[PDB]
Amino acid sequence: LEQAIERAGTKHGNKGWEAALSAIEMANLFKSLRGTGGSGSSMEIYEGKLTAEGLRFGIVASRFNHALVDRLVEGAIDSIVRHGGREEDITLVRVPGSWEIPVAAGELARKEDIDAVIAIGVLIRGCTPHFDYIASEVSKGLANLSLELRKPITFGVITA
Amino acid sequence: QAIERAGTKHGNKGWEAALSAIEMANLFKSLRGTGGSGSSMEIYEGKLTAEGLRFGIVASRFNHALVDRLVEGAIDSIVRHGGREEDITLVRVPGSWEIPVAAGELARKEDIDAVIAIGVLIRGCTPHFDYIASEVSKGLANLSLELRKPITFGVITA
Amino acid sequence: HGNKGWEAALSAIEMANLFKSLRGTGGSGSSMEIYEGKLTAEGLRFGIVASRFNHALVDRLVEGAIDSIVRHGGREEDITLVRVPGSWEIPVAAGELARKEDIDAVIAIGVLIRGCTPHFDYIASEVSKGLANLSLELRKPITFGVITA
Amino acid sequence: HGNKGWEAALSAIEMANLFKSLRGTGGSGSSMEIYEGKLTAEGLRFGIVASRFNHALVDRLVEGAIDSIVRHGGREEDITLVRVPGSWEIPVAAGELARKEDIDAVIAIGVLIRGCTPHFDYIASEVSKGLANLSLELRKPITFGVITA
Amino acid sequence: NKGWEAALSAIEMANLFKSLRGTGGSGSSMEIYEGKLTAEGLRFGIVASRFNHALVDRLVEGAIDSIVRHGGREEDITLVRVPGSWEIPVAAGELARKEDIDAVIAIGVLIRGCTPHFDYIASEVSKGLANLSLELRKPITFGVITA
Amino acid sequence: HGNKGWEAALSAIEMANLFKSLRGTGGSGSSMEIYEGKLTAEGLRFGIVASRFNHALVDRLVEGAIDSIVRHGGREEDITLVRVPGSWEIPVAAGELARKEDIDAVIAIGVLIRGCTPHFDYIASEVSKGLANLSLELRKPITFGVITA
Amino acid sequence: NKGWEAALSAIEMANLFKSLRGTGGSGSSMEIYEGKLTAEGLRFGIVASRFNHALVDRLVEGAIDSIVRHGGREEDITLVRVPGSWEIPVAAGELARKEDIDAVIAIGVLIRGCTPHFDYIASEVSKGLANLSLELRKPITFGVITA
């Protein structure tokens, strides 16, 4: 009975839904940017499709507060499969804490098979009028890696 | 010309109207299929794919400024979701009163999986019952149950 | 050229032309199909249903409707006029005209009774509901030219 | 127990028990015939339809509906659940679910807009009218568990 | 209308870089470099977000309008739409590295205001565009707004 | 065919025809004289003044206006288009076009700024007042196609 | 900065009137008149108030800055200061009648807002400038603000 009540709820509105959704329309956008150019006679507009067929992804999740981390990752995987993706092209890596997220995502982003990287985690405290050191450093690596490896990385953590 | 297409068409009522037809047209295909093995709860949910599906959109010509934004939003919701623009047919009606009759003819065709209703309803400045907005709402609902196909209600009130 | 009978006549003309396109052969592809009716009334057969309350106002609406049919290339011989005593039983008279294969479009003209505005009336709520149910089952367009004084 | 989902599922349980009693032959007599429904769900196959709009509140309603059915002797295996994006097309999906010969009762769960309408709402009436008409035509019970926000 | 101001700044930066890339003066006087407000023969690029669609469309509308009014041609304008406010720096990096683009304009809308504490999301987009301009030696106008 | 630019163009056409009737020779009597303008645009010279705010919406109104001129028999060569930066100074641009003997009718198209509805604004109150004073003194018709967003 | 916008509008009105005053086209196509954004060889005139000196000086600062940045010359700019918000229309009438001035810019600051009823002072300044432009056939930009 417990195995059925957990799947009764829907995972559409969680933060992991749009975090994975943004990566689907970003992998297809880079394909068109580096492809052939336009034919002229009009303004060129580039946008990404929502077809997740033939795309290899990667998900990194923390370990703190597994009652909430597991909620987001389940909703993250549901985005790809419901959009035409396959579970055969999903790689999941778990890290002890949020400090190790940027280093773990660097290894996956350097592989030629991976097309996008999704990072999921939970921040500590946050609701304070003081500078946070562990919270600021995790945003440094993700932004720097994306601009260096030319690969999208999605920031989809939540603060409680 | 490029000025008009620069604006976005995401989030308007035409986007959700076409989005619901994507799930409904795929949910029905799973229902007619073989049932599950058992020993667990069976949950049906339609995927957001749009490849190999044919759609039809009916639009009212009244209030041409607002309708064109909604019509283009529904068209872009199909192509960006994997659909093909060769499988989309479009019909126009003089007003919102002629939408249920036109939507019925498109649904009678075998090669149509969903029907999108797009229109603008004139909002009464004084609060009173409308004898036109009620007929179009009940007309589409009765056709959906009778013809075993889903029709999406995607009109707005000015 | 500005009365409500002009607009109702125009809607019945292009809707009849649009219905023949769907029943005809489809396109060859390679493009997105778009259907729209023209304003040619040649070869079309029309039927007009008019009430009798406010006889002064109805005559203008009926005269305005017949003028639009012949102005857009429609033959005067191919129209049928039926007078109706009360606005309540317009749907039953309109159904008989639309049940024959000769008539292609049916136009309903009438004037409603204005009583208490903020409440709900039953005479006006049934003439519109009956006309809507007739079009969906007979597969024919029926315009709604009924106005309120 | 305190939510409306608990009450909605309970009504569909004993109503299904009432319908199977009418199929059997009548008694010999000597007393007036009274028919009652029991709270036993053994051998009953039920279907649930829920809307995804405002999923914060819908998950609580479906929590009570799925908790009461297992409490009253109903096994989890024979429960079918279908999700819809909006409450507008609740009876469209329920029409196909109720038409199956392996189903007994259909329970619909949804949340509508606030109820301070001026005179009428064009969405809340369609969902209620569709389910009532569907139940009479198919002769199968349908429970209206939709709660206005 | 910050869209008009952001597009105006990028117009006179391309001419300034063209003058620096060109040959110098003949001497005998002070050397002064200036940026004209003529967009003749210039190809630009616009990156826009998809949050608060009402506000963004107003800012994007003035971006193209500023170029064409100042003599620019609509044929040489490239427009890219991005999902959120986080992805502009990585999206602009691929666009700015093309040899047929002389200026890049970034349009977006932030979520929070300025009264709360330090915002991590708002800092990354500003830091990413600053590093790209210095590394690629190409101007990138920063013209987002704060809600 | 339904935008506000279509109606403004039609008004400027028949008003120009009506003005020539008054300047011509009068009737012979024996009846009540009635004057009305036709919808023939041949031999007429028109001038169009358009603003620049909401460039997406203005283009449709300008395109709708020029279509009505050529559809009713008007020569495309005999129209003059003048673009105006702001809606406040439309009257001064319109006066220059109407002060020459070549132009017969002047069409003004613009979009007003919507701020606080129940109060009084001065930008919109002067564009309409200036246009009205120009027509009475120049003896030429000037339409008012300015809409509000 | 409404001072920049008011000066920008007056720049492209002088060219529009010069094209209309000039000879027409050769035909065989639609005749379209446009206003360029080049202030070469144009003489302007600015009228400013002396109420809320902090706000007015900011608006006046952008007025001269807009002209010089768009190719205009500071030599051909005339500036007049007026006591209050009431005297601009009569002051601008004497300035606009000179044959060496092609455009007039009015800068001022109102007292009240827009929530109270009809303001008699605010209406007279707007009505005076509108009548002068039509009577003298010379553009007069209206660019005041409301406190």
Using CA of residue B26, residue B31, residue B36, residue B38, what is the dihedral sign? positive
- Enumerate the β-bridge partners of residue D33: none
Write out the DSSP string of A87-106: GGG--EEE-SSGGGHHHHHH
Indicate which technique resolved this structure: cryo-EM
Residue among F1, F112, F113 at smallest CA distance from F60:
F1
Would the CB atoms of B10 and E53 count as touching at under 8 Å?
A: yes
What is the distance between the alpha carbons of residues B141 and E76, in angstroms, rounded to a whole number? Answer: 49
Would the CB atoms of D66 and A4 count as touching at under 8 Å?
A: yes
Q: Give the per-residue SS3 of C48-109.
A: EEECCCCHHHHHHHHHHHHHHHHHCCCCHHHEEEEECCCCCCHHHHHHHHHCCCCCCEEEEE
Do D and B touch, 3+ Cβ pairs within 8 Å? The answer is yes
- Enumerate the β-bridge partners of residue B156: B120
Would the CB atoms of A10 and D59 count as touching at under 8 Å?
A: yes
What is the distance between the alpha carbons of residues E86 and A154, in angstroms, rounded to a whole number? Answer: 8
Residue position matching structure tokens 């009305």: F36
F110 near G106, Cβ under 8 Å? no
E91 near E31, Cβ under 8 Å? no
Q: What is the DSSP letter of E84?
A: S
What is the distance between the alpha carbons of residues E61 and E48, in angstroms, rounded to a whole number? Answer: 11
* Cα distance between the two ends of chain A: 30
Residue position matching structure tokens 């946050």: A126
- Best of D61, D66, D78 to mutate (most A CBs within 10 Å, chain A): D66
At position B127, the amino acid (one-letter code) is P
Give Cβ neighbours of residue D103 (< 8 Å, ≥ 6 apart). D45, D46, D47, D80, D97, D140
At position B30, the amino acid (one-letter code) is S
Q: For residue B77, which residues of chain A lie inside 8 Å, CB to CB? A: none
- Enumerate the β-bridge partners of residue D112: D148
Using CA of residue A50, residue A51, residue A54, residue A59, what is the dihedral sign? positive
Reading the block at residue C86, the tokens are 């009360």
Q: What are all long-range contacts of B24-27, with beta carbons under 8 Å and residues at least 24 apart?
A: B24/B114, B24/B150, B24/B152, B24/D84, B24/D85, B24/D89, B24/D92, B24/D93, B25/B53, B25/B55, B25/B113, B25/B114, B25/B150, B26/B53, B27/D82, B27/D84, B27/D93
User: CB-side exposure of E121: number of CA atoms within 13 Å?
Assistant: 18
Reading the block at residue E73, the tokens are 């041609």
* F3: nearest CB among B3, B7, B64: B64
Query: Considering only alpha carbons, which residue of chain B is nearest residue C127?
Result: B131
Residue D17 dihedral angles phi and psi, to the nearest 5°: -65, -25
User: CB-side exposure of F145: number of CA atoms within 13 Å?
Assistant: 30
What is the distance between the alpha carbons of residues E4 and E11, in angstroms, rounded to a whole number? Answer: 11
Would the CB atoms of B11 and E57 count as touching at under 8 Å?
A: no
Would the CB atoms of D81 and B42 count as touching at under 8 Å?
A: yes
Q: Is A83 a catalytic residue?
A: no
Query: Considering only alpha carbons, which residue of chain D is nearest residue B128?
Result: D119
Q: For residue B101, which residues of chain C lie inside 8 Å, CB to CB? A: 135-136, 141-142
Min distance E37 CA to chain G CA atoms (Å):
7
Rounded to 10 degrees, the C-alpha dihedral E33/E34/E38/E42 comes to 40
Q: A88 CB near a chain E CB, below 8 Å?
A: no
b/e A30-66 (16+ beta carbons within 10 angstroms → b):
beeeeeeeeeeeebbebbbbbbbeebbbbbbbbeeee
Q: For residue E74, which residues of chain B lie inside 8 Å, CB to CB? A: 2
Give Cβ neighbours of residue F119 (< 8 Å, ≥ 6 apart). G114, G115
User: Among G31, G32, G75, G117, which one carries the catalytic annotation?
Assistant: G117
- Best of F51, F53, F54, F55 to mutate (most E CBs within 10 Å, chain E): F55
> How many other CB atoms are found less than 10 A from the CB of residue C38?
11
Do F and G touch, 3+ Cβ pairs within 8 Å? The answer is yes
What is the distance between the alpha carbons of residues F18 and F11, in angstroms, rounded to a whole number? Answer: 11
B101 near B137, Cβ under 8 Å? no
Do D and A touch, 3+ Cβ pairs within 8 Å? The answer is yes
Q: E80 CB near a chain A CB, below 8 Å?
A: yes
What is the distance between the alpha carbons of residues B10 and B80, in angstroms, rounded to a whole number? Answer: 11
Instruction: Name the neighbours of F, counting chains with at least 3 Cβ pairs within 8 A.
Output: B, E, G
B13 near D53, Cβ under 8 Å? no
G20 near G138, Cβ under 8 Å? no
> How many other CB atoms are found less than 10 A from the CB of residue D13?
25
What is the distance between the alpha carbons of residues A132 and A119, in angstroms, rounded to a whole number? Answer: 19
What is the distance between the alpha carbons of residues A118 and A103, in angstroms, rounded to a whole number? Answer: 13
Q: For residue B141, which residues of chain D lie inside 8 Å, CB to CB? A: 91, 126, 129-130
Rounded to 10 degrees, the C-alpha dihedral G16/G17/G21/G27 comes to 30
Query: Pairing state of beta strands B151-153 and B114-118?
Result: parallel
Residue among F22, F20, F69, F18 at smallest CA distance from F47:
F69
* D83: nearest CB among A1, A5, A10: A10
What is the distance between the alpha carbons of residues A11 and D93, in angstroms, rounded to a whole number? Answer: 21
Give Cβ neighbours of residue E84 (< 8 Å, ≥ 6 apart). A22, E49, E50, E51
Using CA of residue D52, residue D55, residue D59, residue D61, what is the dihedral sign? negative
Residue among G27, G23, G13 at smallest CA distance from F79:
G27
Would the CB atoms of D81 and A8 count as touching at under 8 Å?
A: yes
Cα separation values, F42 from A116, B37, F14, F45, F82, Å? 64, 78, 11, 9, 22
What is the distance between the alpha carbons of residues B56 and B112, in angstroms, rounded to a whole number? Answer: 7
Residue D84 dihedral angles phi and psi, to the nearest 5°: -125, 150
F112 near F146, Cβ under 8 Å? yes
Min distance G57 CA to chain E CA atoms (Å):
21
Min distance C44 CA to chain B CA atoms (Å):
18
Would the CB atoms of E128 and A135 count as touching at under 8 Å?
A: no
Q: For residue E61, which residues of chain F lie inside 8 Å, CB to CB? A: 55-56
Q: For residue B65, which residues of chain F lie inside 8 Å, CB to CB? A: 3, 57, 60
Inter-chain contacts counted by CB atoms under 8 A, chains B and E: 22
Residue F111 dihedral angles phi and psi, to the nearest 5°: -125, 130
Q: Which residues of B are catalytic?
A: 128
B102 near B61, Cβ under 8 Å? no
Residue among F148, G68, C16 at smallest CA distance from B105:
C16
Kindly list the strands in the beta sheet with B114-118, ordered across the sheet, starting from the edge strand earlier in the chain.
B151-153, B114-118, B55-60, B88-93, C33-35
Q: G68 CB near a chain E CB, below 8 Å?
A: no
F128 near F94, Cβ under 8 Å? no
Query: Considering only alpha carbons, which residue of chain B is nearest residue A44?
Result: B2
F89 near G141, Cβ under 8 Å? yes
A26 near A152, Cβ under 8 Å? yes
Cα separation values, C130 from A4, C80, D57, F115, Å? 49, 21, 39, 45
What is the distance between the alpha carbons of residues A27 and E87, in angstroms, rounded to a whole number? Answer: 12
Would the CB atoms of A43 and E80 count as touching at under 8 Å?
A: no
Residues present in chain A in total: 160
Reading the block at residue G133, the tokens are 């432009």
Q: Which of residues 1-60 of B touch E (CB under 8 A)?
A: 2-3, 6-8, 10-11
The rounded Cα B107 to chain-centroid distance in angstroms is 12
Would the CB atoms of E79 and A22 count as touching at under 8 Å?
A: no
Q: What is the DSSP letter of B34?
A: P
Q: For residue A146, which residues of chain E lie inside 8 Å, CB to CB? A: 89-90
Q: Which of residues 98-137 of D touch A (CB under 8 A)?
A: none
H-helix or E-strand spanning residue E21? helix E2-21
Cα separation values, G63 from G2, G13, G68, G74, Å? 9, 15, 9, 11
> How many other CB atoms are found less than 10 A from the CB of residue D132?
11
User: CB-side exposure of D22: number of CA atoms within 13 Å?
Assistant: 8
Q: For residue B24, which residues of chain D lie inside 8 Å, CB to CB? A: 84-85, 89, 92-93
Would the CB atoms of G35 and F85 count as touching at under 8 Å?
A: yes
Residues present in chain G in total: 147
The rounded Cα D138 to chain-centroid distance in angstroms is 14
H-helix or E-strand spanning residue B59? strand B55-60
Q: For residue E74, which residues of chain A lie inside 8 Å, CB to CB? A: 43
b/e G75-107 (16+ beta carbons within 10 angstroms → b):
ebbeeeebeebbebbebbbebbeeeebbbbbbb
Using CA of residue E113, residue E114, residue E117, residue E121, what is the dihedral sign? positive
B143 near B151, Cβ under 8 Å? yes
* D59: nearest CB among A1, A4, A9: A9
Kindly list the strands in the beta sheet with B42-44, ordered across the sheet, starting from the edge strand earlier in the chain.
B42-44, D79-84, D46-51, D105-109, D142-144
Please give the angle made by the CA atoms of C15, C17 and C19, to the nearest 5 degrees. 70
Please give the angle made by the CA atoms of F16, F18 and F20, to the nearest 5 degrees. 80
Q: For residue B45, which residues of chain A lie inside 8 Å, CB to CB? A: 82
What is the distance between the alpha carbons of residues F110 and F54, in angstroms, rounded to a whole number? Answer: 9
At position E55, the amino acid (one-letter code) is L
What is the distance between the alpha carbons of residues D141 and D16, in angstroms, rounded to a whole number? Answer: 7
Using CA of residue B46, residue B51, residue B56, residue B57, what is the dihedral sign? positive
Give Cβ neighbours of residue E32 (< 8 Å, ≥ 6 apart). none
> How many other CB atoms are found less than 10 A from the CB of residue D15?
16
What is the distance between the alpha carbons of residues F33 and F39, in angstroms, rounded to a whole number? Answer: 20
What is the distance between the alpha carbons of residues C24 and F14, in angstroms, rounded to a whole number? Answer: 41
b/e F2-21 (16+ beta carbons within 10 angstroms → b):
ebbbbebbbbbbbbbbebee
Cα separation values, F134 from D48, F5, F96, F99, G127, Å? 71, 21, 10, 10, 15
Do B and F touch, 3+ Cβ pairs within 8 Å? The answer is yes
Give Cβ neighbours of residue C25 (< 8 Å, ≥ 6 apart). none
Cα separation values, C106 from B92, C14, C15, C53, C86, Å? 20, 13, 11, 20, 18
Reading the block at residue D63, the tokens are 């929590």
What is the distance between the alpha carbons of residues D132 and D103, in angstroms, rounded to a whole number? Answer: 18
Q: For residue G37, which residues of chain E lie inside 8 Å, CB to CB? A: 37, 69-71
At position D130, the amino acid (one-letter code) is G
Rounded to 10 degrees, the C-alpha dihedral B31/B32/B36/B38 comes to 80
At position E119, the amino acid (one-letter code) is D
Q: Give the per-residue SS3 of F57-120.
A: HHHHHHHHHHHHHHHCCCCHHHEEEEECCCCCCHHHHHHHHHCCCCCCEEEEECEECCCCCCCC
Query: Considering only alpha carbons, which residue of chain B is nearest residue F60?
Result: B65
* E128: nearest CB among A46, A130, A143: A143
At position E116, the amino acid (one-letter code) is P
- Best of B1, B3, B5, B8 to mutate (most E CBs within 10 Å, chain E): B8
Residue position matching structure tokens 């010069």: G18
* C128: nearest CB among B88, B91, B135: B135
What is the distance between the alpha carbons of residues E81 and E88, in angstroms, rounded to a whole number? Answer: 9
